[PDB]
Amino acid sequence: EGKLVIWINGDKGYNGLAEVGKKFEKDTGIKVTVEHPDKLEEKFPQVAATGDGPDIIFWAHDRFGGYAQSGLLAEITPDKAFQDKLYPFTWDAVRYNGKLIAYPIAVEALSLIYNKDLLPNPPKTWEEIPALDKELKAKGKSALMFNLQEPYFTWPLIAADGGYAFKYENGKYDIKDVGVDNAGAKAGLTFLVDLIKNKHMNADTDYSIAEAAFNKGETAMTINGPWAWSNIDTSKVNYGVTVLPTFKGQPSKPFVGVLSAGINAASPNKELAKEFLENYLLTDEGLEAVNKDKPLGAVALKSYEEELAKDPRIAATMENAQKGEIMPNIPQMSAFWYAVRTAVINAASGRQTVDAALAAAQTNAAAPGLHAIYGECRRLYPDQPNPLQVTAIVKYWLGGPDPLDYVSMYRNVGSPSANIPEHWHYISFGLSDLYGDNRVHEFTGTDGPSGFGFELTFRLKRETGESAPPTWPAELMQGLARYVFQSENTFCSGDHVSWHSPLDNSESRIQHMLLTEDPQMQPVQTPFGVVTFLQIVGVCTEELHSAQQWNGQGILELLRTVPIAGGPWLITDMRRGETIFEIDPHLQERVDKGIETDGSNLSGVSAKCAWDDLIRTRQLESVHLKFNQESGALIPLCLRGRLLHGRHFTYKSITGDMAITFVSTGVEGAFATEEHPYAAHGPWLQILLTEEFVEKMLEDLEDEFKLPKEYSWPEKKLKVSILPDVV
Ligand SMILES: OC[C@H]1O[C@H](O[C@H]2[C@H](O)[C@@H](O)[C@@H](O)O[C@@H]2CO)[C@H](O)[C@@H](O)[C@@H]1O
C-alpha cells in the first residue's frame, strides 16, 4: 500500500482538487490527502530533506528549477501520446537541464479586473489613475487596490519600462546580469511609490485587504489572476477582466507562470502519483473539477483549453501573458524574488529611497552567500518577511568602517512552556562570504569555511512596552566584527571577549561576552563555504573571570541552569543586577571542582608583583615573592589549577619588567631544574615546585583583611602587601 499527499497553495482550488482525489480513491482504493500549508513553496525544500513532505507539490514553474537542482524532484516520464495532449510551450516551462521535472497544469498571468458599475471604461494607462482616484474619492470610493506585499503584483509596472530579472542572452541566462537596477525599473517603482505618497494607495495593503475592498465595491479596480475570479462571482460584483494599464506608452509586462505539479524524489509512491496526475487530474473531467472551484486560467490540456477559450476572461489573461514574459525556472529565481520583495516594501513604506532600494536588490539578487542565511532566517521566522534591519550605508569594501553589511532583527516570541522569555534575535551578514567575488573575503570554494566561517547572533530580553527591537546591539556586533577582521583571529564556541564596558552603554552590570553555538540557527551550506552561527552572551565581570579560570563551555552550562541569566537559549537580560554566584552560591563550588579536575585555562596574568633574592642565569636558593592582594588571591588557582596539572603559570609585572613563572615537575622548556628549583634569567624568575610541596603549600594559604601577611618555609618566603607597587 501507500498514501498520496498533495500540497497546493491556498488561493487555488484545493477543494476541487480534493474532489479529483476522491474519485481516485474510489476507483483505486488509495487515499488522497490534500493540504494547503502557508509558505509551502519555502517549506518544501525544508522538509523534503527529511522526506516528511508531500508526494506531489503544486506551484508556479519558477520554483521548480531550484528544487530540481537540489534533487528534490523525480524526473517525470510521460510517453509521446500524453505529451501531445498538452501544449509544447508548457512542457518548456517545466524543463530543466534537459529533463521534464513536473507536469504543467495551467497558464497564469495577472490581468486588470474592474467594476463595470463604478468604472464602465477602465483606464488604458497607469498615469490616468491618480486623476481617476480623485473623482472616485469624492463619492467616497477608491480607484485601485492590489497586493503590495508580494513583488509578483507590482512587477508588471516595474518591468513595463523594460526592467528585468535575468537576460536571455547567448542561449542561457546571465546570473550576475540582473535588471532591477536600471532606469526602466526605477521609473516603474518611482511611480508606484508616488501613488502611495499622494494617498491613492496605502503601503499596508496586502492580498486579503484588496480582495475584500473590491468585492464589497469599495474600490474600482484590482490586479489578480484567474484564481481570484471565483470569489468575485460570489460577491455578485458586476466586473470585467481586461488588459493591464500601459506605463509611459509601453505595456505592463506581468511574469507569466505555469502552475505545475512535481513529484517528490523521496516519494515511495511515484507510480501512484503518475497515475493520479496523468489519468485523473489531467483530463477534461479532472481539470474541470479544479476549474470550477477556482479558475485555473488557460489550461495546458489542449482539449479542455479549446472548450473554455470562448470565455473572454481567459482571452484577457493570455493577452496580458503575451505582453509579459514567461518566468525563468533557474535556481536563482527565488533569490531575485526575495531581493525585490524587499526593495518594493522598503521603497513603498518609506524605509528607503527607490534609488537605493533597487540598487540593493541588484547586489543581493546576484549574491549567493547572503541568500542562504536569509533562508535559515526565514525558516525560523516565516511570519516576518520584512524585519527591522540595520544596513551599513558606506560598504566595508569601499573603505567603510563597519564590516557587517546588514544586521537583521527578528522578534522571537520565546516559549511559555519552557520558561524562555520573549526576546529580540539579531543575525549579522558579512563575517561569512556573501558575494564570493573577492570583494571582502577570499573565495575558497564550497569546501571549507565561508569567509570567517560564521555570523554573529544575539538574543536580547524584550523590555516592557517595547514595540520594536533596539538598535544598539547592531552597533555592538559591528564592534566585535571589527575585532575579528583586523586581527584575523576567528572565534569558536566557548571563547570569551573582554569588553570592559556595559554592552548597551547604560550602567548595566553585563559588561562582557561569551560565545556559543546559537541554539536554533543551523549551519548552512553555501557555494562559497560553510556558515555556522555564533551567539553572543552578555556576562558580568565576575563570570568572565570564571570562564578564564576554568573554561568557556563550563560557564555556559551554568548560565543555562539559571533561567534569569540565560536559560537554555542563553538570552541576555541587560537589567540583570546579580551574578550567577549571588543567585545560587552553591555554583561557586561547581567551578572550583571543575578547575580541580579539568584545570585552569589561565596561563598567566599581568598583576602587581615582584621577586627578590635573599645577561646571566642566576641560580638562587632563597627567594622572596611579593604580590598584591588581588593577584595574591590567584596563587591557589596557580597551584591547584595548573602546577598540579603539570602546567606553568606566569605573573608579569606591569610595574616594571619582573616576572614569576611557576613551573611544575616535568614540563619542557624551563631552566629551573629541581636540582636547583629557583633560577632567574633576568627580571625573569622561574621557580619549580614538587607536587608534595604544592599540596602542603595550598594548606598553608587560606584567603579577612590583615596586612602585610607573610608565609615562610625551609625553602622560601611569600609576602602579600599593599601600596609599594604603585609607588
Ligand atoms: O511574489 C513573489 C512570488 O511570485 C510568484 O508567486 C505567485 C504565484 O505564481 C501565483 O500562482 C499566485 O499564487 O501568486 C503568487 C504571489 O503571491 C512566484 O511564482 C513565486 O515563486 C514568488 O515567490
Q: Which amino acid is at 568?
A: P
- Ligand 1 binding pocket includes 211 (Cβ within 6 Å): no
Integer Cα distance of 306 and 257 in angstroms: 20
Query: Which triple of cell numbers denotes residue 491?
Result: 572565534
Buried b (16+ CB within 10 A) or exposed e, 401-425: ebbbbbbbbbbbebeeeeebbebbb
Ligand 1 centroid–CA 464 distance in Å is: 38
Residue for cell digits 527529511?
50
Name every residue whose Cβ is closer than 8 Å to that of residue 707 and which is 6 or more positions away in sequence.
629, 720, 721, 722
| Cβ 11 under 6 angstroms from ligand 1 | yes
Euclidean distance between the first and final Cα of the chain, in Å?
A: 89
Three-state SS for 359?
helix
CA–CA separation, 512 vs 57, rounded Å? 49
Q: What is the 3-state secondary structure (H, E, C) of 75-106?
A: CCCCCHHHHCCECHHHHHHCEECCEECCEEEE
Kindly write down the DSSP assignment for every residue of 89-155, as one continuous string: HHHHHTEETTEE-SEEEEEE--EEEEETTT-SS--SBSTHHHHHHHHHHHTT-BS-----SSHHHHH
Contact 154, 347 (CB under 8 A): no
Task: Collect all residues with Cβ–Cβ distance below 8 Å to 588 and sequence separation of at least 6.
Answer: 581
540, β-bridge pairs: none
Cα separation of 500 and 495, whole Å?
Answer: 16
Q: Resolution of the coordinates in A? A: 3.0
60 C-alpha vs ligand 1 centroid, how far in Å?
A: 7
The residue contributing the CA closest to ligand 1 atom 17 is 150
Q: How are beta strands 649-652 and 678-680 bridged, if at all?
A: unpaired
Cα–chain center distance at 533: 10
Pairing type for strands 717-720 and 623-627 reads: parallel
DSSP H stretches of helix in 161-200: 183-197
Contact between 105 and 261 (Cβ < 8 Å): yes
The CATH classification number of 1-385 equals: 3.40.190.10
Residues 6+ apart with CB under 8 A from 148: 154, 192, 201, 203, 205, 206, 344, 345, 348
Would you call 448 helix, strand, or coil by DSSP?
coil
Q: Give, in degrees to the nearest 5, the angle at Cα 527 between 521 and 533.
A: 20
Nearest to 289 by CA among 45, 105, 30: 105
Mutate to test the pocket of ligand 1, among 38, 152, 326 (most ligand atoms within 8 A of CB): 152
- Report d(CA 584, CA 564) in Å as an integer: 12
Longest dimension (CA), the chain: 112
One-letter amino acid identity for 458?
Answer: F
Distance CA(213)–CA(196), nearest Å, equals: 17
Ligand 1 centroid to 37 CA: how many Å? 15
Which amino acid belongs to residue 714?
P
Phi-psi region of 535 (alpha: psi -120 to 50; beta: other; left: phi over 0): beta
Query: CA–CA separation, 587 vs 560, rounded Å?
Result: 12
Distance 132 CA to ligand 1 centre (A): 29
Closest atom of ligand 1 to 259 CA is: 11
10 Cα–ligand 1 center, Å: 12
CA of 115 to the centre of ligand 1 (A): 24
H or E element, residue 348: helix 333-349
CB 156 within 8 A of CB 130: no
Question: Which residue do the cell numbers 527578528 mark?
Answer: 410
Is the shortest distance between the CB of 60 and ligand 1 below 6 Å? Answer: yes
Strand 618-620 to 604-606 pairing: unpaired
Contact 675, 613 (CB under 8 A): no
Do 312 and 331 contact (CB within 8 A), yes or no?
A: no
Q: Which residues pair with 678 in a beta bridge?
A: 620, 687
| Nearby residues of 494 by Cβ (< 8 Å), 6 or more positions away | 514, 515, 516, 551, 552, 553, 556
CA-proximal residue: ligand 1, atom 15 (nearest)? 152
SS (H, E, C) 632-694: HCCHHHHHHCCHHHCCCEEEECCCCCCEEEEEECCCCCCCCCCCCCEEECCCEEEEEECHHHH
Handedness of CA 7, 8, 10, 15 (dihedral sign): negative
Nearest protein Cα to ligand 1, atom 14: 152
User: Computed from CA positions of residues 302, 304, 310, 312, in that sequence, does the dihedral angle turn out positive or negative?
Assistant: negative
Partners of residue 247 on adjacent β-strands: 250
Radius of gyration (C-alpha) of the chain in whole angstroms: 34
C-alpha atoms less than 13 angstroms from C-alpha of 722 in its C-beta half-sphere? 5
CA 298/CA 226 separation, integer angstroms: 9
Q: Whose CA is nearest to atom 23 of ligand 1?
A: 337
For residue 265, the one-letter residue type is A
- DSSP labels, 8-56: --TTS-HHHHHHHHHHHHHHH---EEEE--TTHHHHHHHHTTTT-S-SE
